[PDB]
Amino acid sequence: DRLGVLTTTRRVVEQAQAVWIDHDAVAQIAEAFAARQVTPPTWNRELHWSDGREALANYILVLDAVNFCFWGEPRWRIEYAGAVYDGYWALAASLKRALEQGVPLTDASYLAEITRDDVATIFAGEGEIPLLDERARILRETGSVLAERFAGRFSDAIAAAGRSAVALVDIVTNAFPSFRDVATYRGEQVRFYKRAQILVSDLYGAFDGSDLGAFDDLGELTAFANYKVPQVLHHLGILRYAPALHDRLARREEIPAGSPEEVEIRAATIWGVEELRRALASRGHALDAYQVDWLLWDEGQRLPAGTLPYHRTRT
């Protein structure tokens, strides 16, 4: 466990007061999923950009640099190619739209200088993308780090990882401040690395596990601790919430980042996915943790009306 995600999150799950795993539900869900050999959907080619290897690598870094927090009222929505999108697909569509119209979002020099008005345009739609100013700041940071340390080419970073997913995550968090996703729980560091790990899985997807998307150790990735997958796990009965936390989610009350409740959700998400992975493998359906994450995130796109709302964090 070379990044320390499973180890540090396990300490949280063992001590967690507001969240816990129902291991019976894990078994039952594993039974049904294994029975019908459920598979994550293939990496989406419609709403993701495609290009030569240098531009594509840079595109994946930018996509995942700003891959966070899409909730808020009035709901942020995007119109692209005769369809309306929200959440992640709104992000994806927005970038694809910008690149098609020839915005140089894969060029480090442009990213280093990108303005608030640039990103407001790129993500123009109904409402406004949350944390707009932050996204502008992250893209400027991303650009100037690319330019300074990687000759403007994320492919330089990828090459230095030598086909290790774990090594690339560590290269990314070392160089790019925005990707440093750790917190504390009762005085101990907890390590998550959501966006850094999702980046690696997205290279694998975009490059079909060849060239720059070749990795020999993808099993070492964890789930990407977000707000949608815990909502799915709660829906499937795998995550249970204590009274005050349940009521907070129901009221759509925001939870401060790094607070005990929030850290417990994220840790239990990691271990909820890991426990489902082990239970599936037990029943002869071997998937990597990132695949179980993909599969659950996909289920999260068509949850029934009146499932408990996902938790709302911000920072």
Ligand X SMILES: Nc1nc2c(c(CN[C@H]3C=C[C@H](O)[C@@H]3O)cn2[C@@H]2O[C@H](COP(=O)(O)O)[C@@H](O)[C@H]2O)c(=O)[nH]1
Chain breaks in the chain (C to N over 2.5 A) after: none
> Distance between CA 132 and CA 114 in Å, rounded?
12
Contact region for ligand X (CB under 6 A) — 1-9, 67-75, 149-157, 236-244? 67-75
E strand or H helix at 191, and its extent?
strand 188-191
CB of 187 to ligand X, least distance (A): 27
Please identify, among the stretches 1-9, 26-34, 225-233, 245-253, the one whose residues bind ligand X according to the rule CB under 6 A: 225-233
Long-range contacts of 47-50 (CB under 8 A, 24+ apart): 47/85, 47/89, 47/92, 47/93, 47/96, 48/92, 48/96, 48/205, 48/206, 49/95, 49/96, 49/99, 50/206
Q: Is 229 in the site for ligand X (CB under 6 A)?
A: yes
> Could you say whether residue 88 binds ligand X (CB under 6 A)?
yes
Stretch binding ligand X (CB under 6 A), from 4-12, 94-102, 243-251, 290-298: 290-298
Q: Does 226 bind ligand X (CB under 6 A)?
A: yes
**Stretch 159-198 residues interacting with ligand X (CB under 6 A):** 198
- Does 94 help bind ligand X (rule: CB under 6 A)? no
DSSP state of 45: S
From 33, 59, 68, 241, residue interacting with ligand X (rule: CB under 6 A): 68
Q: Does 44 bind ligand X (CB under 6 A)?
A: yes
Number of residues this chain uses to bind ligand X (CB under 6 A): 23
- Residue 227 sits in the site that holds ligand X (CB under 6 A): yes
74: cis peptide before it, omega within 30°? yes
Q: What is the rounded distance in angstroms from the CA atom of residue 94 to the CA atom of residue 261?
A: 32
Q: Are 85 and 104 in contact (CB under 8 A)?
A: no
Residues that bind ligand X (CB under 6 A): 40-41, 43-44, 67-68, 70, 87-88, 198, 202, 205, 223-224, 226-229, 293-294, 297, 300-301
